């Protein structure tokens, strides 16, 4: 009684995979067939399921109009049609048979890992400051390689706004932005500073890099 | 100095989408216009950039052969089809101009949001627990609903490994579990226990329940 994995890897976004059991020592046309997938250093989580290639076949959200489950029954093979994968498809992917009353998820493939990937990291802190009017603020965003000719800028966000621009160029403020706003850095410690804040200045501020063709983001720090 | 967007909505996996920016204000023809991307709760992320008629089309690795980036400079338009969409994609969508060394990102799109769109909740406690042989062991597993049938089933977990089924049906211990091992409960209160702890009991177990078509998992307790 036994599930033969196949499949996986690595890939870039936007691509596709096939996986596949074979089912060995049961009746594979009684049983329903699941599939199942575990992220890393994280839980499990189910992703389809097929039934007596009925087939009434069920997805799960995350899944829908990329993923698409199939069955063979004269060859007692399950597949996952995996295709335009992002890089949250990254997981270990198992093949389950489904019980119900009668075991659960009593008999499991090994597992095969289903990786999905591809560079200026820019990296804030922190997360969040909890500060009162008037008081400074003092954001870092640190670049894992040096941004050349300082093309590092800040934006500001409100809710369900557009972000509006701030600094360019390291330390050049932009049309229409206050003296208290001011950027500093080479290199790769660059930091922003409100010396004194403003009631509407408490949103959520980005830096940005563009001293090449892949253009990124920090992940914002929040000032409340 | 304006750009007047349009488009978005609600669609489902697979869909098609189209938007648009109107310039006002400068010399379109000539300006280096990006498309920059939002999801709900997420930080920035650029999509796709467009520049004059000797230049190169850049997308996102996530994007390239869905999207289409395009551009009339005699109506004064940025365009952004967008075909095979997916949940992933989900996300306010802005346009922007491009201004490099002389301010970045310095003219935005309002923004349009496009959403692409088509469960018990199980909890163990404690996350960790660290104990030397001989001793018993206690793990929890709570359901936000109640599980019909008591159809809840116990894995074990042992460092990258497929998990092996323990308990299911609530307190059927399956064929080959020590009986050290038993669970107990039902409803939304499930706890399996291990009475004498050996050295090779020591790794991750997770619950799992099946009552529903969207079955779901715990998160784990792991035992030092």
């Known amino acids: 009684v036994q599930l033969v994995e196949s499949g996986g890897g690595l890939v870039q976004p936007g691509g596709s995979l096939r996986l596949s059991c074979a089912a060995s020592g049961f009746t594979f046309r009684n049983s329903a067939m699941h599939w199942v997938r575990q992220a890393p250093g994280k839980g499990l989580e189910w992703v389809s399921s097929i039934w007596y290639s009925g087939s009434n076949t069920y997805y799960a959200d995350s899944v829908k109009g990329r993923f698409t489950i199939s069955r063979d029954n004269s060859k007692n093979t399950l597949y996952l049609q995996m295709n335009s994968l992002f890089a949250e498809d990254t997981a270990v992917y198992y093949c389950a048979r489904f019980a119900g009353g009668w075991g659960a998820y009593d008999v499991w493939g090994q597992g095969t890992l289903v990786t999905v990937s591809s560079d200026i990291v820019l990296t804030q802190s922190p997360a969040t400051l909890s500060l009162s009017p008037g008081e400074r603020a003092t954001l870092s965003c640190r670049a894992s390689?040096?941004?050349?000719?300082?093309?590092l800028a800040w934006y500001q966000q409100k809710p369900g706004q557009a972000p509006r621009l701030l600094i360019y160029?390291?330390?050049s403020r932009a049309t229409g932005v206050p003296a208290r706003f001011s950027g500093s850095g080479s290199g790769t410690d660059f930091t922003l500073t409100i010396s004194s804040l403003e009631p509407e200045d408490f949103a959520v501020y980005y830096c940005?890099?563009?001293?090449?063709?892949?253009?990124?983001f920090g992940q914002g720090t929040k000032v409340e | 100095v304006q750009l007047v967007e349009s488009g978005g909505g609600l669609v489902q996996p697979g869909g098609s989408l189209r938007l648009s920016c109107a310039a006002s204000g400068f010399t379109f023809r000539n300006s280096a216009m990006h498309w920059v991307r939002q999801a709900p709760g997420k930080g920035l992320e650029w999509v796709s950039s467009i520049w004059y008629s000797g230049s190169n089309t850049y997308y996102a690795d996530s994007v390239k052969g869905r999207f289409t980036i395009s551009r009339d400079n005699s109506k004064n338009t940025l365009y952004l089809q967008m075909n095979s969409l997916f949940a992933e994609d989900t996300a306010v969508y802005y346009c922007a101009r491009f201004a490099g060394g002389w301010g970045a990102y310095d003219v935005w799109g309002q923004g349009t949001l496009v959403t692409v769109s088509s469960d018990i909740v199980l909890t163990q406690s404690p996350a960790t627990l660290s104990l030397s042989p001989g001793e018993r062991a206690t793990l929890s597993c709570?359901?936000?609903?109640?599980?019909?049938?008591?159809?809840?089933?116990?894995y074990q977990q042992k460092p990258g490994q497929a998990p092996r089924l323990?308990?299911?049906?609530?307190?059927?211990?399956?064929t080959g579990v020590p009986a050290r091992f038993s669970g107990s409960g039902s409803g939304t209160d499930f706890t399996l226990t291990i009475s004498s702890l050996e050295p090779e009991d020591f790794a991750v177990?997770?619950?799992?329940?099946?009552?529903?078509?969207?079955?779901?998992?715990?998160?784990g307790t792991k035992v030092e």
């Open positions: 160029d390291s330390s």
């Open positions: 390689q040096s941004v050349s000719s300082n093309y």
């Open positions: 940005h890099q563009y001293s090449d063709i892949s253009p990124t």
